[PDB]
Nucleic acid binder design. Structure first.
Ligand SMILES: O=P(O)(O)O[C@H]1[C@@H](OP(=O)(O)O)[C@@H](OP(=O)(O)O)[C@@H](OP(=O)(O)O)[C@@H](OP(=O)(O)O)[C@H]1OP(=O)(O)O
Lengths: 189, 329, 141, 216, 57, 54
RNA sequence: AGUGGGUAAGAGC
RNA sequence: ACUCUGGUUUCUCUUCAGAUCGCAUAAAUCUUUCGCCUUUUACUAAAGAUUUCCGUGGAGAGGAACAACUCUGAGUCUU
């Protein structure tokens, strides 16, 4: 037998039930709870290396979470096809240069952006329902960037395209000369 | 171009060349995978969640773990906020202030969790709609370039400054390329990849220290000038042990101190360069003591002629060390 | 080390502390095989007879006697504890930890001075004694 | 070639009785049963030696009670007491001790002795200054051969031909050499450009290092 | 020290040849990474542009 | 007793993860120790012969 | 840059 | 122009890693020189030795996928 993916609200309920010391429901379940707390630095590293790119809005990433809500690892290695990654970043370089040239008085986001005593916002009434904004994305030319426009700004551009990538593991990418030339022309910057 | 950007260029080149030169082939490994035995254990569950949700969850979990570590000895006067700033709740007494001292590892962990909190908070602010995607990218770049100013985690590990001086350099590498043409100097750049990867590469090496420190700290049971006094005492013990092993101690227990006194007397006689001959001492025992004295004398001479030459070179030495070395010389 | 008396269980340590009415009890908490513990053992054995009048020396292995490790913070490689009439005595050594001598001292004269100062201070009823020599700096030059 | 000039001039045949020793910290019954287990038993090994290494005995390390600070002197026969079945030599190898006792088989026509100096102790290398007292005129080596191999040999008398001496500490020393002139019988000591005639009487009054003997 | 001392500079040269490094035109069609193309076009010496216009028939 | 049975699981996890190069580096340490002891025997070894003669 | 090396001991309520 | 050829993906496990394991790059320990120097804990910067960590390739083993013919090639494959 194998364990399957739990519903997303399961971990949310587990974490919300682990509010503070006020609840007397859990007072002695400590050994197992603090046994995995030693692995906090890996949890720190996982989300920082899996943090979404500036052309993305929502990044549904796999998560390995403790059954008591102690810890949560982003169980994904950020694999990227390097020519596509560099071309995407060149597109962002162009876009940010144009935006900085255009928007005169650019607003500096203030740090820290939240009150010190303010608890973290729950992912049920602050971020989940609200429509995400538009990420930085270059206006791809429909004629020059014909092959890449379909999949340029996807999370993993061609993951299920069995022709170009071997499978879901996203390794050993095979490309064609037209799309590589398009990527190079985009990434000249 | 100004001097600062040039020095940034040479410093980046220096770090790159140091990385390349000190490269070593990866050691053969049996391929034991993390996050793969977790799902094997009946303690972890797999799912798929939005990244911002996971970041908020990890920030909350890290805050809870740090709060649990703070209230370790039931000392509830060190308030840790949700931005990972630790402060006393009141004017704590000097006894309490001494009693509420945490090592550099704890504060490094606190500041690194503060940095992750800043990153996830920037993502949350972008998701809410207060800041545009351009503003989110600029904020992330400013975070990854001004970690020292925003966090100050170098105060608990100064080698981390090596990262900071790099990141600032990367900024000087980028801005003067970013702000070259009609775009003037301003806070508009958002090319945060360089600082992000630099800090990740710091994390991949700083993880084992914090992991082992918290594993020892949160465990049920806690665990925790010797060059010259290394060979001598052990040598005596060894010799003593040998004798007591072949001495019929069940019949001759009373002679252990006698044997040790004989050893000390022989060592003193050699040190004073005076004849030494115990008449009633057995021949094998005399041979034992003679060999022990020879070994101790060789160690003594080598130690003297090592410490004297160390002192001549200008090395930092204690006062009793100098007196003992002068006596030996 | 092996010359000095050894205590095998915590009750023996309690009896040793209680049975001394007019001598300061100096207990070395550590492991006989530890080189720093070896330095403490050799210094103590060197001055175990000189200060016999107003002191006594006992050796306790914290592995076989962990009964104090939690309460006395017996986690340094070698610690020295001074007691007088069933009362632990603190020494303002200058290192910030007045409870114990957690480091190895090379000079036996310094340890004799420490023991004598402890005896003088604790005989007068005091619980903390100021060390004759400062130890906030190793004076290496 | 089996017999080159060096082989027929210096090489000789000698026999080693190597016996494995159990760990000395073992029970007596266990030691006896290990000895009976045929692993810690004596084994005979023949070999060819270009020279014989002479192990100087331990220094007194203490002043003589009567005449203080006397340089040790050992007869040549005590050093020659090696290479026979009566005397063993417990080699203290770092892994385990070996009970090796030697025995000469076939003496070479010319004999080379090397007195072991410059022995590295546990911390550095020191030079043993013990002097060996030997009869320069002749020595007898028939008594240091087994009864099986004494029938073949007829000339075991050896006379000293060359003597090497090291003067000074191992860090900086001088190698002097005395040589016996066959034509005149005189001993000449030469050190670098210096050449002097030395009486045979005080040949043994030096830290002998390498000795070359002729069987005649 | 957050910043870097000016004394750490290595590109100090008494030789004008190394002080003034001949910029590469990259055949008049290449562009150095980062800098906007328009600034480099209006900055390049256009020796190759002049040669092309002379050889443009 | 669902508390002490988690410590054993965590310890087994840590041992399994530390087993990546454990045998390799322990073999290397053993070889280095033998090489070091080649020229510098143990102190009791230097006295073994005299000990037996005792 | 930085943590410390800055605990007065005592009497019972 | 033919009969048999039998998939690829993915999850694991177990060993081996030679090769830029990695067209990338960390930290710690130890040992030498160091720079600060005043005690630990941070350190300065070069060399040397291991180690842990984020990763990687191959092999083998065990699953699922899931279908399935075929791909492909051994050849007689034919005008
Ligand atoms: O060299 P400094 O004078 O200390 O300041 C420079 C400079 O800022 P200023 O020259 O305007 O002070 C940078 O921007 P450029 O002017 O080179 O475009 C950059 O400033 P921003 O990141 O705010 O654009 C950054 O200043 P800071 O570190 O204060 O942000 C940097 O300082 P460093 O040399 O310390 O990196």
């Amino acid at each position: 037998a194998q364990k399957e993916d739990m519903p997303p609200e399961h971990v949310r309920k587990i974490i919300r039930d682990h509010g503070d010391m006020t609840n007397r429901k859990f007072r002695h379940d400590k050994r197992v709870y603090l046994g995995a707390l030693k692995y906090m630095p890996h949890a720190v590293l996982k989300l920082l290396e899996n943090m979404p790119m500036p052309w993305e809005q929502i990044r549904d990433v796999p998560v390995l979470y403790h059954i008591t809500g102690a810890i949560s690892f982003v169980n994904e290695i950020p694999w990227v096809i390097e020519p596509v990654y560099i071309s995407q970043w060149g597109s962002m370089w162009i876009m940010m240069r144009r935006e900085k040239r255009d928007r005169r008085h650019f607003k500096r986001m203030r740090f820290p952006p939240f009150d010190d005593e303010e608890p973290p916002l729950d992912y049920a009434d602050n971020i989940l329902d609200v429509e995400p904004l538009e990420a930085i994305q270059l206006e791809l030319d429909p004629e020059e960037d014909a092959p890449v426009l379909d999949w340029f700004y996807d999370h993993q551009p061609l993951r299920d395209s069995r022709k170009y990538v071997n499978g879901s593991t996203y390794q050993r990418w095979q490309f064609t000369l037209p799309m590589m030339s398009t990527l190079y022309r985009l990434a000249n910057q | 171009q100004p001097v600062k950007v040039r020095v940034s260029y040479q410093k980046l080149l220096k770090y790159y060349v140091l990385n390349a030169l000190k490269h070593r082939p990866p050691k053969a490994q049996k391929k034991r995978y993390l996050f793969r035995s977790f799902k094997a254990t009946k303690f972890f569950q797999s799912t798929k969640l939005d990244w911002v949700e996971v970041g908020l969850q990890v920030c909350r979990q890290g805050y809870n773990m740090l709060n649990l570590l703070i209230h370790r000895k039931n000392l509830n006067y060190l308030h840790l906020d949700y931005n990972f700033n630790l402060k006393p709740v009141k004017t704590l007494t000097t006894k309490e202030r001494k009693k509420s001292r945490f090592g550099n590892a704890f504060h490094l962990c606190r500041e690194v969790l503060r940095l992750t909190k800043l990153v996830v908070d920037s993502h949350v602010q972008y998701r809410l709609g207060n800041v545009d995607a351009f503003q989110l990218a600029d904020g992330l770049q400013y975070i990854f370039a001004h970690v020292g100013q925003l966090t100050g985690m170098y105060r608990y590990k100064y080698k981390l400054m090596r990262q900071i001086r790099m990141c600032k350099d990367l900024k000087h590498l980028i801005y003067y390329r970013f702000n070259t043409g009609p775009v003037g100097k301003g806070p508009g750049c958002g090319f945060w990849a360089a600082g992000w990867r630099v800090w990740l590469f710091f994390m991949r090496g700083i993880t084992p220290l914090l992991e082992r420190w918290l594993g020892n700290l949160l465990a049920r049971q806690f665990e925790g000038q010797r060059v010259e006094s290394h060979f001598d005492l052990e040598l005596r013990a060894a010799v003593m042990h040998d004798i007591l092993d072949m001495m019929p101690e069940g019949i001759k227990q009373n002679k252990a101190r006698t044997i040790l006194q004989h050893l000390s007397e022989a060592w003193r006689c050699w040190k004073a360069n005076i004849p030494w001959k115990v008449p009633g001492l057995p021949t094998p025992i005399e041979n034992m003591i003679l060999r022990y004295v020879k070994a101790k004398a060789d160690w003594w001479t080598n130690t003297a002629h090592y410490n004297r030459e160390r002192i001549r070179r200008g090395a930092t030495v204690d006062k009793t060390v100098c007196k003992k070395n002068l006596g030996r010389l | 080390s092996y010359m000095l008396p050894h205590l095998h269980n915590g009750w023996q340590v309690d009896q040793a502390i209680l049975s001394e009415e007019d001598r300061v009890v100096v207990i070395r908490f550590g492991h006989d095989w530890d080189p720093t513990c070896m330095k403490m053992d050799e210094v103590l054995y060197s001055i175990a007879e000189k200060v016999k009048n107003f002191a006594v020396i006992y050796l306790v292995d914290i592995t076989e006697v962990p009964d104090f490790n939690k309460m006395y913070e017996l986690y340094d490689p070698c610690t020295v504890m001074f007691f007088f009439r069933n009362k632990h005595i603190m020494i303002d050594l200058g290192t910030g930890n007045n409870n114990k001598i957690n480091w190895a001292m090379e000079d036996k004269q310094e340890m004799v001075d420490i023991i004598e100062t402890v005896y003088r201070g604790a005989r007068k009823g005091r619980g903390l004694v100021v060390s004759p020599k400062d130890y906030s700096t190793k004076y290496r030059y | 070639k089996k017999k080159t000039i060096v082989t027929d001039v210096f090489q000789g045949s000698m026999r080693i009785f190597t016996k494995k020793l159990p760990h000395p910290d073992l029970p007596a019954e266990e030691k006896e049963q290990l000895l009976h287990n045929d692993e810690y038993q004596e084994t005979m090994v023949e070999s060819t030696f270009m020279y014989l290494t002479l192990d100087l005995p331990t220094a007194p390390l203490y002043k003589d009670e009567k005449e203080q600070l006397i340089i040790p002197q050992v007869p040549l026969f005590n050093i020659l007491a090696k290479f026979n079945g009566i005397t063993e030599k417990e080699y203290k190898t770092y892994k385990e001790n070996f009970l090796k006792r030697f025995q000469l088989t076939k003496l070479p026509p010319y004999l080379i002795f090397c007195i072991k100096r410059f022995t590295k102790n546990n911390f550095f290398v020191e030079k043993n200054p013990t002097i060996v007292n030997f009869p320069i005129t002749n020595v007898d080596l028939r008594e240091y051969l087994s009864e099986e191999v004494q029938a073949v040999h007829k000339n075991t008398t050896y006379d000293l031909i060359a003597n090497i001496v090291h003067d000074g500490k191992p860090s900086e020393g001088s190698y002097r050499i005395h040589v016996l002139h066959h034509g005149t019988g005189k001993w000449y000591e030469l050190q670098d450009l210096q050449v002097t005639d030395i009486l045979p009487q005080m040949i043994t009054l030096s830290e002998a290092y390498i000795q070359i003997w002729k069987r005649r | 020290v957050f910043e870097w001392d000016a004394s750490e500079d290595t590109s100090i040269d008494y030789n004008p040849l190394y002080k003034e490094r001949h910029q590469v035109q990259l055949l008049g069609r290449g562009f150095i990474a980062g800098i906007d193309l328009k600034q480099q076009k209006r900055e390049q010496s256009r020796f190759y542009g002049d040669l092309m216009e002379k050889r443009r028939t | 007793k669902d508390d002490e049975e988690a410590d054993a699981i965590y310890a087994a996890l840590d041992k399994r993860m530390d087993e990546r190069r454990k045998e390799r580096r322990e073999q290397r340490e053993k070889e280095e120790i033998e090489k070091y002891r080649m020229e510098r025997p143990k102190i009791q070894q230097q006295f073994s012969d005299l000990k037996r003669k005792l």
